[PDB]
Amino acid sequence: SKSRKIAILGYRSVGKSSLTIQFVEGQFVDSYDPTIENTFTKLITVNGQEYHLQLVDTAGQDEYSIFPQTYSIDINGYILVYSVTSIKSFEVIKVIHGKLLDMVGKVQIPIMLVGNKKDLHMERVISYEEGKALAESWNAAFLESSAKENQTAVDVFRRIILEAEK
Amino acid sequence: XXXXXXXXXXXXXXXXXXXXXXXXXXXXXXXXTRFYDQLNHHIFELERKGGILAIASLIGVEGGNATRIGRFANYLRNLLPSNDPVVMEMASKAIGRLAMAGDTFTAEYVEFEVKRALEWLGADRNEGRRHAAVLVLRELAISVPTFFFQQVQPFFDNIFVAVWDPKQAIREGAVAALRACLILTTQREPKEMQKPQWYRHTFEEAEKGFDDDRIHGALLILNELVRISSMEGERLREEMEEIXXXXXXXXXXXXXXXXXXXXXXXXXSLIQMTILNLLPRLAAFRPTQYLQDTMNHVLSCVKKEKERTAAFQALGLLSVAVRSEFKVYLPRVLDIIRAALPPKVDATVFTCISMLARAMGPGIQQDIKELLEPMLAVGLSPALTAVLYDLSRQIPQLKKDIQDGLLKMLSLVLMXXVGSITLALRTLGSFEFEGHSLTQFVRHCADHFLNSEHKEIRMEAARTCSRLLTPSVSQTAVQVVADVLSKLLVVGITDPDPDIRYCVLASLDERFDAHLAQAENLQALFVALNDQVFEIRELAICTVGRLSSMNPAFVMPFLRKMLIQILTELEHSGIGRIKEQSARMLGHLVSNAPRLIRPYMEPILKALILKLKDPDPDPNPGVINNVLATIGELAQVSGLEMRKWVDELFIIIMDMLQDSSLLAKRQVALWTLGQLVAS
Amino acid sequence: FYPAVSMVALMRIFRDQSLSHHHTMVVQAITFIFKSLGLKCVQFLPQVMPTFLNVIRVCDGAIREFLFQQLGMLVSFVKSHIRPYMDEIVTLMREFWVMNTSIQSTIILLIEQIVVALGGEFKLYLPQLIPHMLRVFMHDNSPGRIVSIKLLAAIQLFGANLDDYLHLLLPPIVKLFDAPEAPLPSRKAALETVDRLTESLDFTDYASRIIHPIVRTLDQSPELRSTAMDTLSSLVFQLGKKYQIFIPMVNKVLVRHRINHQRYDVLICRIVKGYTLSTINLQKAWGAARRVSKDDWLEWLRRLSLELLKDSSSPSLRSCWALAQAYNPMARDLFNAAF
Amino acid sequence: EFWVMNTSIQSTIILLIEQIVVALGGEFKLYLPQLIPHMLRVFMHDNSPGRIVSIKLLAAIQLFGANLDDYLHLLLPPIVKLFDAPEAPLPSRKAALETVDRLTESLDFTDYASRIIHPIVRTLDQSPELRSTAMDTLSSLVFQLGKKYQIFIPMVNKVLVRHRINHQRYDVLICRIVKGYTL
Ligand SMILES: Nc1nc2c(ncn2[C@@H]2O[C@H](COP(=O)(O)OP(=O)(O)OP(=O)(O)O)[C@@H](O)[C@H]2O)c(=O)[nH]1
Ligand SMILES: [Mg+2]
Structure with a gap:
């Protein structure tokens, strides 16, 4: 009966809480309130193995924010997030990974990268290709995602558990 | 700086490792971050042993802040899981030193290490996973007892998946984790509502598996439940090594142990070993018929070679555990010890002699006189x-x-020829002889001292000849003592290696000082007073200081000129290290030679106060500390003489106590404050 | 109640010695508190603000770029109510402006939020800042002159404030959109800036200052011909029949390179003719009372207090949890309130 | 005011000190302690090509004579730290040995027998290049100490036999001490 802790980091107003609450509960409308440590829990199975996820939905880190010490001591996963509707999110997410690697040393830590708000075609400015190449350059996985589809976010949290499996 | 300690660090990867680690501790104290982190990281990946030595050297020596505890944890999680041993042990030991860092992620950390460790004991993977997890659980239980005890319910429901798995090295380990946690249980259950569910669970699991691969594991668990349930007999075992809920079932485990012993004696020599640790332990629990089968099993095993060096310990601990019934087998057992000792492992023979004599009492004596001339024929062992x-x-x-x-x-x-001399000399001083004949031994120790290009004969001959001269009235002992001290003290000033120079001077006690008071000896000690090494100077000022009563005409002048040189160092050297060392030495000179200082109270005290008033001795904390420490001792000596200055100091000190920007260890400031008010 | 308690605990840290590590944490909380309160935040101002500004002067530059980001955040929620402390703020900004991309970015974003806060009131504090602004355009080592772009984007927002100081500030703007060397993006921003300023100032004095360089830009660089026309068009709109002098002179470049804007052509023709228009995590720390020594019970307490802070429905306590772990007396003191 | 850690000025200022000392003579002793903080800062760390700044300052210190009396305990340690340390470029090291030789002719060294002798002994072992130089320092130091040297004779002898070293000056004086009749 395995138990895994997962940290969703990123820039703010991207959709960390939007995804996290979609996976855990399954509702289109979500808390439009800036969160400080919104923890969650969920029961799911991945290839027969029982996994209790404990999801740390963190407060969104800006360009300068000194990186927390709760996350360098506990966690078997990081879902680093950007939103496809700004370049802002993408420059920020590069530096989060910067500081995160400065925080833990450089060990083979289970990461992925996530592009939220794919449903927004008409406000999109980042492409599938850039983030795929950035993910590939870190030795990390990629997905695009949508808080509007519980189906997609399910596939995300499955991916990170499979990365930490390795 | 960084590349120098990097060359040292990559050298520690190849005794040299631990030496370079001691140097790393000294260098971190002298203080940069990321260069040494990158250095550790790149020694980590390939070599791994050096990574652990460095990680362990920096935990506590720095004042290890949270950025260290974030990294070090994540390094040590990718040493253990998939490994090959030795590295494994030192990784979990380093988790021991780390999980008592002091930072408030200790609950978070230890909750994580233990939950992960118990997940490796929930599916038969790589038996290195088991090896790892269990070594972690053991070391966290010892080092961090609170947070480990917090996770006890899954723990006792998950080692009995994992003593039983088919391995030899796991067994010792998985019972060592159980040993640590049951030592926590001993100190808790007096206060909890009712008696626990645990000891019953332990005994019942041991019994389920007991009823070849499963015997050894069961017997190790019995070795533990017997350890806890009678805290008396283990003391006995430990004493020889230096040189009540089991009460319900004690006949069941007895019948079980002896039956399985004789009926697996010609199978394995592992299971035999754990039986030779139960029988002495169960004998001390409840003292005829069992004892004959016991001693027949044990004494038959002494002729055979594998178990002999354990069989002696069992034979010894049984001679305490049941004294009276053992007195039948002394004619049998002394033949065994006699046959053990005609000169050419043998240590345990000597421990059995000590217990055999100790336990039953002084009714062997003449038989032990027949044993003595054998024992001595072996030579000089430490045992x-x-x-x-x-x-x-x-x-x-x-x-x-x-x-x-x-x-x-x-x-x-x-x-x-050589390494024996060290232990011979150690013996010569370290237990009490009743011969005058020692006077020849001390004069022959002039040979060992002067020569011996070997360092260790010198450093030990020193430590002997100080100890032997304790008869320091009549005129033969006196000339000898004086003849030695000259040669002895010569080495204390003159010898090239600092360590001997320290040892010699430190061993020149108050016992001698009526010989040190002579002109000639004293001229030599003053040379020590301005040595190459600082620690030796600190020593010599104390020494000469003691003598300033004894022969004041020589001493007191020298000490005055020393005082002047000291105050000059304080005022006029711009270097911090020099001032720090200077004030520190002034401390000693004040406390030790009070008669000298009590006239020069005002000058000293002004010069000291004026250090505390300056704005730019903040780049070294130790100047301010050692200045305050001195004022403490200067206060002690003065007494009422230093009344008018107390108000000045009091403002200064109380201003330091609040707002620690002038960050003295408040220990020192509070101490001085106490001292002023006391004096 | 809740915001008031948190504010007092936070500010008790917010005094040198403990902040050596935990500045950032405190300020992140505060900013979240005010964000959450609305305009009822205003009551805490005189507690926070004097300490806050003194922190900036005292602290190390490791932090300092962050504090200004968050100061500008306080400014935005509070809006005009910050006016009493504005002197000190401007003194701080004036002290910590240097010719370095590092700080300048953030300080300029601060100005952006001050202007919108004070509105008409900013006009007073403007001249303390003009010496620095003119020093930015005059010389700047920024990659692609982006510092000066952001400052242009700030100047866009000054509106009627800029009235009494346009004669200072308009020349160096013009010197961007005329000079050949200047990288195209900066140059564009300066043209678009003059376009914004036209909607809320008068340009009748500076017809000759602006028009001749636009005319020059139309010739030299073909890339900005659309952009510059959209500046000029609006400038014409604002001038009205005062433009009648320039029509022919400008026309002689408009025919040269065959340039067509609806907006321009319309207005010229129009001038000449004359007619313009929550509990599952808590439950672990409640009855975990299987405890026996001093350390065992204290650690029950610690974990309980923090477990409370995470839950607590009030945002102004939630905020602190982050800090409450890293500094334990924050949890200690909020314990009763948290509970 | 105008002392800095730069070869540029230091050279000249040190030449100034050289001319002041000879000017004032006995009087310089008063003004010395205002300058010691700078002098110790020169030896402690110096970026000079081949440490020549510190050579010139050694060559200055050679001239202080009896002035240096009250401050030898300050100034003798960093001099010693040159002629012991492995890294130091040979010319500087030589000057420091020759400096202690000069100072022996116009100060007392009885306090600092142990400070000086052990490093000389060390230098005799490690580097063979300065064996003549260091012997000529030691010889003079022995001359100045007199029978106070009697302690050290054997200890030093054990390196003097190890590398087979012969100085008239040294051998003469040791034999002269043991028998007891100095000129
Ligand atoms: N329309 C639409 N909106 C989305 C989608 N994904 C996320 N969002 C919106 O993103 C907005 C901001 O995200 P939040 O979840 O509030 O903020 P956060 O990412 O948790 O970051 P913090 O504020 O730092 O906690 C929300 O108002 C969501 O409605 C999507 O697929 N479609
Ligand atoms: Mg959120």
């Missing part, structure tokens, strides 16, 4: 001379009989 100390002390009629031969042994070593 032997330790036993002969124990034996002389406990059986007092053999006080003279021991030392008769033991000297004309030692004499035969030091009339008539």
Whole structure:
């Protein structure tokens, strides 16, 4: 009966809480309130193995924010997030990974990268290709995602558990 | 700087490792971050042993802040899981030193290490996973007892998946984790509502598996439940190594242990070993028929080679555990020990002699006189001379009989190659002889001292000849003592290696100082007073300081000029290190030679106060500390003489106590404040 | 109640010695508190603000770029109510402006939020800042002159404030959109800036200052011909028949390179003719009372207090949890309130 | 005011000190302690090509004579730290040995027998290049100490036999001490 802790980091107003609450509960409308440590829990199975996820939905880190010490001591996963509707999110997410690697040393830590708000075609400015190449350059996985589809976010949290499996 | 300690670090990857680690601790104290992090990281990946030595050297020496505890944890999680041993042990030991960092992620950390460790004991993976997890659980239980005890319910429901798995190295480990947690249980259950569910669970699991691969594991668990359930007999075991809910079932485990012993004696030599640790332990729990089968099993195993060096310990611990019934087998057992000792492992023979003598009492004596001339024929072991100390002390009629031969042994070593001399000299000082003949030994120790290109004969000959001269009235002892001290003290000033120069001078006690008071000896000590090494100077100022009563005409002038040189160093050297060392030495000079200072109270005290008033001695904390420490001692000596200055100091000190920007260890400031007010 | 308690605990840290590590944490909380309160935040101002500004002067530059980001955040929620402390703020900004991309970015974003806060009131504090602004355009080592772009984007927002100081500030703007060397993006921003300023100032004095360089830009660089026309068009709109002098002179470049804007052509023709228009995590720390020594019970307490802070429905306590772990007396003191 | 850690000025200022000392003579002793903080800062760390700044300052210190009396305990340690340390470029190291030789002719060294002798002994072992130089320092130091040297004779002898070293000056004086009749 395995138990895994997962940290969703990123820039703010991207959709960390939007995804996290979609996976855990399954509702289109979500808390439009800036969160400080919104923890969650969920029961799911991945290839027969029982996994209790404990999801740390963190407060969104800006360009300068000194990186927390709760996350360098506990966690078997990081879902680093950007939103496809700004370049802002993408420059920020590069530096989060910067500081995160400065925080833990450089060990083979289970990461992925996530592009939220794919449903927004008409406000999109980042492409599938850039983030795929950035993910590939870190030795990390990629997905695009949508808080509007519980189906997609399910596939995300499955991916990170499979990365930490390795 | 960084590349220098990097060359040292990559050198520690290839005794040299631990030496370079001690240097790393000294360099971190002298203080940069990321260069040494990158250095550790790149020694980590390939070599791994050095990574652990460095990680362990920096935990606590820095004042390890949270950025260290974030990294070090994540390094040590990718040493253990998939490994090959030795590295494994030192990784979990380093988790031991780390999980008692002090930072408030200790609950978070230890919750994580333990939950992960118990997940490796929930599916038979790589038996290195088991090896790892269990070594982690053991070391966290010892180092961090609170947070480990917090996770006890899954723990006792997950080691009995994992003593039983088919392995030899796991068994010792998985019972060591159980040993640590059951030592936590001993200190808790007096206060909890009712008695626990645990001891029953332990005994019942051991019994389920007991009823080849499963015997050894069951017997190790019994070794534990017997350890906890009678805290008396283990003391006995530990004592020889230096040189109540089981009460319900104690016949079940007895019948179980002896039956399985004789009926797996010609199978394995593992299971035999754990039986030779139960029988002495269960004998001390409840003292006829069992004892004959016991001693027949044990004494048959002493002729056979594998178990012999354990069989002696069992034979010894049984001679305490049941004294009276053992007195039948002394004619049998002394033949065994006799046959063990005609000269050429043998240590345990000597421990059995100590217990055999200790336990039953002084009614062997003449038989042990027949044992003594054998024991001495072995030569000089560390074990032997330790036993002969124990034996002389406990059986007092053999006080003279021991030392008769033991000297004309030692004499035969030091009339008539190298590493033996060290232990011979250590013996010569370290237990009490009743011969005047020692006067020849001390004068022959002039040979060992002067020569010996080997460092260790010198450093030990020193530590001997100080100890032997304690008869320091009549005119033969006096000339000898004085003749030695000259040669002895010469080495203390002159010898090239600092360590001998320290040792010699430190050993020149208050016992001698009426010989140190002579002009010539004193001229030499003053040379020490301005040595190359700082620690030696600190020592010599104390020494000369003691003598300033004894022969004041020589001393007091020298000490005055020393005082002037000291105050000059304080005012006029711009270097911090020099001022720090200066004030520190002034501390000693004040406390030690009070008669000298009490006239020069005002000057000293002004010069000291004026350090505290300056704005730019903040780049070194130790100037301000050692200045305050001195004011403490200066206060002690003065007394009312230093009344008018107290208000000035009091403002200064209380201003330091609040707002620690002038960050003295408040320990020192509070101490001084206390001292002023006291004096 | 809740915001008031948190504010007092936070500010008790917010005084040198403990902040050596935990500045950032405190300020992140505060900013979240005010964000959450609305305009009822205003009551805490005189507690926070004097300490806050003194922190900036005292602290190390490791932090300092962050504090200004968050100061500008306080400014935005509070809006005009910050006016009493504005002197000190401007003194701080004036002290910590240097010719380095590092700080300048953030300080300029601060100005952006001050202007919108004070509105008409900013006009007073403007001249303390003009010496620095003119020093930015005059010389700047920024990659692609982006510092000066952001400052242009700030100047866009000054509106009627800029009235009394346009004669200072308009020349160096013009010197961007005329000079050949200047990288195209900066140059564009300067043209678009003059377009914004036209909607809320008068340009009748500076017809000759602006028009001749636009005319020059139309010739030299073909890339900005659309952009510059959209500046000029609006400038014409604002001038009205005062433009009648320039029509022919400008026309002689408009025919040269065959340039067509609806907006321009319309207005010229129009001038000449004359007619313009929550509990599952808590439950672990409640009855975990299987405890026996001092350390065992204290650690029950610690974990309980923090477990409370995470839950607590009030945002102004939630905020602190982050800090409450890293500094434990924050949890200690909020314990009762948290509970 | 105008002392800095730069070869540029230091050279000249040190030449100034050289001319002041000879000017004032006995009087310089008063003004010395205002300058010691700078002098110790020169030896402690110096970026000079081949440490020549510190050579010139050694060559200055050679001239202080009896002035240096009250401050030898300050100034003798960093001098010693040159002639012991492995890294130091040979010319500087030589000057420091020759400096202690000069100072012996116009100060007392009885306090600092142990400070000086042990490093000389060390230098005799490690580097063979300065064996003549260091012997000529030691010889003079022995001359100045007199029978106070009697302690050290054997200890030093054990390196003097090891590398087979012969100085008239040294051998003469040791034999002269043991028998007891100095000129
Ligand atoms: N329309 C639409 N909106 C989305 C989608 N994904 C996320 N969002 C919106 O993103 C907005 C901001 O995200 P939040 O979840 O509030 O903020 P956050 O990412 O948790 O970051 P913090 O504020 O730092 O906690 C929300 O108002 C969501 O409605 C999507 O697929 N479609
Ligand atoms: Mg959120």
